[PDB]
């Protein structure tokens, strides 16, 4: 019944700033202290900051001291983290965490996290190309069919099929950074070949970072 939900993740350039929010519900928000913990890509957890549940008591890791600024609004059940003068080093997922001091120190409830990217590159929306199912696999059994999401920055994109109506046989793969320092991925779905003749297939690709939501039909060629 009890949740934390992070928001306001985005790309920001060197010298830049950004405000992370964390919605709580299912407890008396003002009854407990809160904490920001970040996970750098392919590294362990690192504590950033924490704030007293009453409010007006703020502590910071020596890495973020005087650049970041914890805050909250108990009336609206929200924690925040104003981040100024961000450098590439600050790139990570930032998870808001309920802090409990009942005997010692432990964080008893986390959010789903939210990504912060500090690169001196530019947010780019994806190109979406249809994947030819199989010229051969047209007559018998089944055949794979998919969407290519190419040349988007930064992560993430989300893929659904026929607005999420089709999910049996769907497989969406992790992305990969090219040498051009740019992300691309694919999502494939397996349906019976006989159905392809008279069943429409459209992948829905949503890129929050450029707010591009492309719907792309996929059907066989000559």
């Amino acid at each position: 019944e009890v949740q934390l939900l992070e928001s306001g993740g985005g790309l920001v350039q060197p010298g830049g700033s950004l405000r992370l929010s964390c919605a709580a519900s299912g407890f008396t928000f003002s009854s407990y202290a809160m904490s920001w913990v970040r996970q750098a890509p392919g590294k362990g957890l690192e504590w950033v900051s924490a704030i007293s549940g009453s409010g007006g008591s703020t502590y910071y890791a020596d890495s973020v001291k005087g650049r970041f600024t914890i805050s909250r609004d108990n009336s609206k059940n929200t924690l925040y983290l104003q981040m100024n003068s961000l450098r590439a080093e600050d790139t990570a997922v930032y998870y808001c965490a309920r802090l409990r001091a009942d005997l010692g120190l432990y964080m008893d409830l986390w959010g789903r996290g939210t990504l912060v990217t500090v690169s001196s590159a530019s947010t780019k929306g994806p190109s979406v190309f249809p994947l030819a199912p199989s010229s051969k696999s047209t007559s018998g059994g089944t055949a794979a069919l998919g969407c290519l999401v190419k040349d988007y920055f930064p992560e993430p994109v989300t893929v659904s099929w026929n607005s999420g109506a089709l999910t049996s046989g769907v497989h969406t793969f992790p992305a990969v950074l090219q040498s051009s320092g740019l992300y691309s991925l694919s999502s494939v779905v397996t349906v019976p070949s006989s159905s392809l003749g008279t069943q429409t297939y459209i992948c829905n690709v949503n890129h929050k970072p450029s707010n591009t939501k492309v719907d792309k039909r996929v059907e066989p060629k000559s």
């Binding site: 008396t28 003002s30 009854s31 407990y32 202290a33 007293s52 549940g53 009453s54």
Partner: peptide, 15 residues
């Protein structure tokens, strides 16, 4: 007192 100061330790923040 303007307050009742009759909260518990768990029904409110450690303030």
């Amino acid at each position: 007192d303007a307050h009742a100061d009759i909260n518990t330790p768990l029904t409110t923040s450690s303030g």
